Design a protein around this ligand. Structure first.
Ligand code: HEM
Ligand code: HEM
Ligand SMILES: C[C@H](O)[C@H](O)[C@H]1CNc2nc(N)[nH]c(=O)c2N1
Ligand SMILES: C[C@H](O)[C@H](O)[C@H]1CNc2nc(N)[nH]c(=O)c2N1
Lengths: 414, 414
């Protein structure tokens, strides 16, 4: 009938009607959460006829990897899995297979710039997990390991796969560590405005609202199918960096800081027909994530106004390019503060250059590299970056990290 | 078989093979010159059966415009055109129809941010033109009018439409005014490196190589079907702005400048089945075009290296964000210099805000707005801009400004 279009800044929604008068030649590239990138719920297992080929394909992928293939084991695994599939329905992956799966899924993530590190990933096997509290422990082990007291390490903790579709392990948080956002009495908004709805959710499940600008939200976990059990993260585990500029001593007066761990929580790992709706992973920050998006987005902390004022710029004259000046200084603050406190981070330039190197390796190696330009190009200094001038094809392979429907919309309340 | 992917920075070409292993869910959005945005040559006229409906549709569009429609004239025009179509094959548009066509084609240009000015356009009817020299005169009239001694005016000069396909009027230049690029003896490159091949072409047609950094290229025109006649643009017509920073007095020592007129030459106007392969149009510059792309691209003037050095930044340390600092200063130089010399220009921020306003008007009005995010988001300070957070659908409507195959690849040499 029509296509929905949302503005993530003002949150406004529009309905596109014109597209119908298009030519006999409509890219959805600009869309954030397209259905083609999401993998929703279920009620029944994966039909054998689908599951089987996917499984075989995957096993062919894996065994087709290593130099000098283990043909016998290849055939054996193929045979063993086929058997296991007909006997149980679903099937279990050899640890070394998961490792390969997680790395390939990352390698296949078109919206990630850090993919040159695809082979350096730590996998935590939590497939035998069965309770929320047990998830919580694995997560803490994850956060602890990843943080490594500043020297951030990329890792992913894979929880139990999907069985029937009503026994899903799910983290309700956007990311492992994330600040809270409260709509205060005086009409304002404190904290991360992006985590507004979710915070209310935590509140609704009896969470204690600490009402600040940097209150780390609680881990909302759900095991098997059972309702979400709220767990607060041990503050000793949450490492942070206090923001301070190398020249503007007044910058620390802003009382700004941010967590050192960028760990995605709510994504789904698809591999060989199987799907793990819970498998938080982490890399390390890229300056612009915090400096540009987190701190300067209208929908987030929105600090541009005053960083500009405090810099003495003509904040009431767009043409003065003060926003360009401020943001840059915020970016250095972040980079400086992370560097100073020995917490891993990479600026957007060195990051882009390494990605360009990644593609070169990728194309020469497997002949391609799924890339989402819109996501790969840094939120600032676009063309100054190599990736801006690089043409790319955005396509979904397998294994893959799909988005998924926010669990609180599709959940049972017993 | 495979998809070609080019890096417009290093000029390197890659062949994507992986895309074939895609999912049963490949956006070409990142591609610069896709076939779906181009309108190539011909050998025969437009088959009546195609031409007719398009024509009717267009006339329906036009007459469906004005408040209180001229039904009788609508029917009459429909009837008159149908007749004219069967009698001649092709047909001629009423001036007021072209005006409407050019504005809608602009209104339908998904890669333009200045579309809020869509209704303020000047049309020069050169459909009765028949010789190169005559084109040259119309062009000069265009350049003169558009420039308006700084107070730039948006305008388009429409040359004769397509007849059979071997009698095409074509401007061989990328844009009306454009500097030359020469690959010098000492291995270097002077001028606009982007206009390298074309400059050689001008040279090949006996053009006098003035060997500088800012030598305005000659107008290479072709009428009917006859070969391209080289015409040099009268220097009095070419208005320029000398670059100078409001604080860094050493900036003018760079001896930088740029033309004030951004006029696209090589595009094709499609309307009601008809197609005008020659119809240069112009708006006014947006700072970042010059400051970021023209001056800071590796493939262009590439001035980042020394603007940084002269600023005293740590040019050998990417993490210092010197590139972010330099570019910003170059942007102000441009904006300042244009403002100082009373030459119309708009910064990227005020531009984006006006586009956001444009969409609002557009959606509410006709229910849509073809937009190419990749092109609409400024080459710097992306997320600081509203359009970055705005989801959009990129689709081809009609009328439209298509790209076209560089004429020197597909031309007769008598
Ligand atoms: C090692 C350093 C890494 C860096 C520098 C890096 C950086 C980034 C950046 C800049 C983004 C965009 C974030 C945003 O705008 O929301 C991103 C997205 C993404 N990254 Fe990477 N990443 C890294 C590691 C990883 C790892 C280890 C995985 C998975 C195993 C991964 C998976 C993804 C996925 C799926 C996305 C898309 C997230 C979404 O759609 O919201 N990244 N990454
Ligand atoms: C009045 C002020 C205008 C402004 C500020 C403006 C600005 C821009 C900018 C920033 C671009 C991108 C240029 C590039 O990166 O190469 C662009 C592209 C474009 N503009 Fe607008 N424009 C204006 C007027 C016009 C007019 C008057 C027309 C046509 C009647 C037009 C047609 C287009 C088209 C077709 C493109 C795409 C060019 C291409 O594909 O290479 N623009 N414009
Ligand atoms: C609407 C638009 O697609 C959206 O704001 C984008 C653009 N590109 C992005 N790129 C990255 N890296 N991260 C993002 O959140 C976004 N958001
Ligand atoms: C390869 C990539 O599409 C290309 O470099 C782009 C991106 N977006 C752009 N946007 C604008 N406005 N102008 C451009 O030339 C480009 N080029």
């Amino acid at each position: 009938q029509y296509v929905r279009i949302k503005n993530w800044g003002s949150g406004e929604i529009l309905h596109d009607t014109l597209h119908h008068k298009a030519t006999s030649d409509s890219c959805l590239g600009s869309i954030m959460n397209p259905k083609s990138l999401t993998r929703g719920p279920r009620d029944k297992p994966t039909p054998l006829e689908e599951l089987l080929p996917h499984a075989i394909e995957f096993i062919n992928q894996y065994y087709g990897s290593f130099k000098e293939a283990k043909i016998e084991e290849h055939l054996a695994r193929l045979e063993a899995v086929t058997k296991e599939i007909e006997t149980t329905g679903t099937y279990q992956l050899t640890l070394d297979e998961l490792i390969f799966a997680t790395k390939m899924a990352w390698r296949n993530a078109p919206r990630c710039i850090g993919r040159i590190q695809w082979s350096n990933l730590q996998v935590f096997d939590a497939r035998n997990c069965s309770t929320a509290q047990e998830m919580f422990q694995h997560i803490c082990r994850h956060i602890l390991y990843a943080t490594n007291n500043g020297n951030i390490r990329s890792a992913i903790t894979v929880f139990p796969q999907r069985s029937d579709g009503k026994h899903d392990f799910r983290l309700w948080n956007s990311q492992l560590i994330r600040y809270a956002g409260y709509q205060m009495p005086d009409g304002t908004i404190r904290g991360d405005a992006a985590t507004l709805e979710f915070t209310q959710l935590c509140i609704d499940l009896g969470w204690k609202p600490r009402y600040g600008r940097f209150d780390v939200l609680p881990l909302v976990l759900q095991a098997d199918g059972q309702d979400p059990e709220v767990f607060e993260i041990p503050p000793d585990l949450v490492l942070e960096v206090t923001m301070e500029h190398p020249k503007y001593e007044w910058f620390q007066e802003l009382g700004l800081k941010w967590y050192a761990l960028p760990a995605v929580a709510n994504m789904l790992l698809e591999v060989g027909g199987l799907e793990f709706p819970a498998c938080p992973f982490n890399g390390w920050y890229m300056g612009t994530e915090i400096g540009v998006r987190d701190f300067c987005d209208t929908q987030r902390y929105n600090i541009l106004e005053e960083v500009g004022r405090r810099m003495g710029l003509e904040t009431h004259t767009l043409a003065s390019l003060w926003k360009d000046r401020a943001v840059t200084e915020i970016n250095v603050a972040v980079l400086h503060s992370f560097q100073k406190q020995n917490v891993t981070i990479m600026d957007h330039h060195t990051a882009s250059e390494s990605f360009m190197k990644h593609m070169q390796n990728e194309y020469r190696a497997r002949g391609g590299c799924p890339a989402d330009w819109i996501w790969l190009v840094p939120p600032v200094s676009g063309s100054i970056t190599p990736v801006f001038h690089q043409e790319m094809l955005n396509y979904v392979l397998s294994p893959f990290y799909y988005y998924q429907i926010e669990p609180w919309k599709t959940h049972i309340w017993q």
